[PDB]
Amino acid sequence: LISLQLLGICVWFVVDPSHSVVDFQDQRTLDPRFARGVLKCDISDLSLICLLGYSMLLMVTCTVYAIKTRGVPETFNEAKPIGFTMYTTCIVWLAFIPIFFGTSQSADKLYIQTTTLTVSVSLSASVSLGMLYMPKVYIILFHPEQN
Amino acid sequence: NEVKSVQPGEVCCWLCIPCQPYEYRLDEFTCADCGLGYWPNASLTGCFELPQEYIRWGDAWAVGPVTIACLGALATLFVLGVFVRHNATPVVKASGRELCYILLGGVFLCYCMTFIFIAKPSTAVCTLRRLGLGTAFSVCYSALLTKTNRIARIFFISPASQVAICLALISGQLLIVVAWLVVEAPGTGKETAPERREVVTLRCNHRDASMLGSLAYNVLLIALCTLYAFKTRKCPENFNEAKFIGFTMYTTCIIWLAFLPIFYVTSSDYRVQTTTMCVSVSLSGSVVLGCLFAPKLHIILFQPQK
Amino acid sequence: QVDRYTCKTCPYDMRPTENRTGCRPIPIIKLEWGSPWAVLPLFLAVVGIAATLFVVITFVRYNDTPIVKASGRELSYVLLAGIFLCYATTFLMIAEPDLGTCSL
Numbered sequence: 042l043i044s045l046q047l048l049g050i051c052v053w054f055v056v057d058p059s060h061s062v063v064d065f066q067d068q069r070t071l072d073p074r075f076a077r078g079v080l081k082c083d084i085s086d087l088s089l090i091c092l093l094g095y096s097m098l099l100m101v102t103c104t105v106y107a108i109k110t111r112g113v114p115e116t117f118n119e120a121k122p123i124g125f126t127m128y129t130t131c132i133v134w135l136a137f138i139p140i141f142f143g144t145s146q147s148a149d150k151l152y153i154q155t156t157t158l159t160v161s162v163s164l165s166a167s168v169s170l171g172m173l174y175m176p177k178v179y180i181i182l183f184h185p186e187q188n
Numbered sequence: 189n190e191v192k193s194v195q196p197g198e199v200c201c202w203l204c205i206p207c208q209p210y211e212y213r214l215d216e217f218t219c220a221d222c223g224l225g226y227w228p229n230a231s232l233t234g235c236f237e238l239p240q241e242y243i244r245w246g247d248a249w250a251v252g253p254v255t256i257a258c259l260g261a262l263a264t265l266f267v268l269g270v271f272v273r274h275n276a277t278p279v280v281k282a283s284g285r286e287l288c289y290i291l292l293g294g295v296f297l298c299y300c301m302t303f304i305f306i307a308k309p310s311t312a313v314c315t316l317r318r319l320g321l322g323t324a325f326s327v328c329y330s331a332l333l334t335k336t337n338r339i340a341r342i343f344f345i346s347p348a349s350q351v352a353i354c355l356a357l358i359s360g361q362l363l364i365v366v367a368w369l370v371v372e373a374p375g376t377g378k379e380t381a382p383e384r385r386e387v388v389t390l391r392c393n394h395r396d397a398s399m400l401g402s403l404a405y406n407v408l409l410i411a412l413c414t415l416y417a418f419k420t421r422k423c424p425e426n427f428n429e430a431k432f433i434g435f436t437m438y439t440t441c442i443i444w445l446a447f448l449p450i451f452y453v454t455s456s457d458y459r460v461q462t463t464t465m466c467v468s469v470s471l472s473g474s475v476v477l478g479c480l481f482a483p484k485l486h487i488i489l490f491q492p493q494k
Numbered sequence: 495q496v497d498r499y500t501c502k503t504c505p506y507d508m509r510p511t512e513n514r515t516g517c518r519p520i521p522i523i524k525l526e527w528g529s530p531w532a533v534l535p536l537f538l539a540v541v542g543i544a545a546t547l548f549v550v551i552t553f554v555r556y557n558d559t560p561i562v563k564a565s566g567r568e569l570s571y572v573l574l575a576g577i578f579l580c581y582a583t584t585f586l587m588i589a590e591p592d593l594g595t596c597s598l
């Protein structure tokens with residue numbers, strides 16, 4: 042299930058030369074003298090969209106199987122936490138879309154993209170780690186509920 | 189398109205310079221210009237009005253929100269029809285009627301708010317936006333707070349008293365939006381910027397990011413309704429309709445916590461801001477429906493014997 | 495320009511100054527670690543790494559209680575190492591673009 046992703050990234054590693062460039066300085070008109078170049082690490086947004094769409098389809102399949110696991114009993118059933126994680130991840134990876142793409146028309150401080158990505162990613166991780174393993178550590182460390 | 193640049197000098201020999209492309213020609217010897225948001229005449233004989241731009245009914249940026257809004261409105265209509273003409277069961281009759289029909293009314297109003305939003309904004313539609321984008325959420329979260337308050341009490345209560353609680357929570361938001369309309373008159377929506385005279389919109393004249401104040405009360409509503417939905421998680425009511433309320437409150441809080449900063453940042457661009465408004469309202473309505481009435485609807489359709 | 499007789503644009507990446515100085519270097523902005531705009535990703539990534547390492551060492555030292563059995567064991571360790579890598583992505587992004595960093 043990771044193979045298609047791996048293929049993906051290698052394909053980008055031959056389609057996109059992966060070169061960094063000092064951004065051409067139309068981030069601000071240079072006539073007002075205090076104009077800046079944010080040294081953007083130029084990675085094409087299409088690769089980001091493709092990789093995230095792959096993860097979205099993968100998590101759609103995860104949600105489908107979580108729904109189908111409704112009848113699982115006791116500690117082996119975690120369909121509801123998984124659905125909660127998927128809802129939170131969808132909201133996160135949708136709240137990401139307007140700032141990164143739409144707001145990017147605002148030339149001033151374009152590196153708000155970088156944070157809008159990183160924060161979003163570490164939030165999604167903070168969900169998958171939290172709602173899946175905190176309700177699993179809280180016992181082992183607090184409640185000797187089981188042998 | 190050109191003016192004779194002056195030099196009295198030795199003799200009356202003129203230069204020629206084209207005017208600023210937004211500056212017209214009212215004198216042969218000097219250009220002329222008019223206010224921002226305006227434009228030069230083709231022969232540069234005066235000021236001309238660039239045509240107002242807005243999110244139109246059929247454009248690509250409104251098709252998605254209007255489609256999700258209409259589908260959600262039809263789904264809410266079906267849900268309320270089933271809960272009205274099939275309410276004899278205790279799953280609805282003993283946990284419903286007009287109380288908890290307030291939920292469906294609020295969901296319908298939320299869904300129609302997207303219809304309200306994508307329209308001509310210059311007219312009183314600004315007033316409709318200012319009142320409704322608050323009141324639609326106020327209805328839903330106030331009725332949810334009434335439900336969780338009741339469950340916490342059983343964790344005065346009477347049908348008319350529940351209606352009164354909902355009405356008072358609604359009157360709070362109505363008074364706050366009335367105070368806002370007192371602060372800022374509604375309408376007169378238009379504006380452009382130094383940059384261009386070639387890009388104009390009918391964005392509402394209410395001050396940017398001010399309506400978040402009207403939403404503050406809604407946020408407080410959530411900040412209570414989640415808390416009580418926590419405290420009441422242990423009590424199994426009819427089909428244990430508690431866990432569902434907690435799920436709904438958590439999902440709505442998750443939506444809000446990202447939706448508010450998203451609006452605040454995207455306020456620079458009107459298109460993405462309005463699309464976000466419509467999508468967030470539709471998402472809140474859909475999550476309320478499919479997290480609260482979905483189990484009851486499942487019970488009353490696929491298990492009619494209950 | 496310092497051209498007295500016919501003035502011309504300074505090139506890209508080289509700011510002007512209509513004084514005796516001549517054209518001047520344009521300021522170049524980076525997402526340096528000293529920026530207040532990077533402290534939020536820094537903090538989120540570091541707390542996520544701490545949480546991931548804590549959960550890893552909890553499973554590692556409780557690798558035999560029936561709830562880590564229910565968690566599927568090493569498939570869960572693969573998931574949690576994936577979360578760790580997804581967190582370290584943030585540490586990698588705030589660094590200077592360079593050449594290897596953009597590839598990674």
Ligand SMILES: O=C(Nc1cc(Cl)cc(Cl)c1)[C@H]1CCCC[C@H]1C(=O)O
Pocket residue numbers: 081082083084085086088089154155158583587
């Ligand atoms: O999103 C970005 N970088 C990026 C990061 C990852 Cl982890 C994956 C991909 Cl595909 C791109 C931003 C911030 C860094 C430089 C400029 C901009 C870009 O679009 O490259």
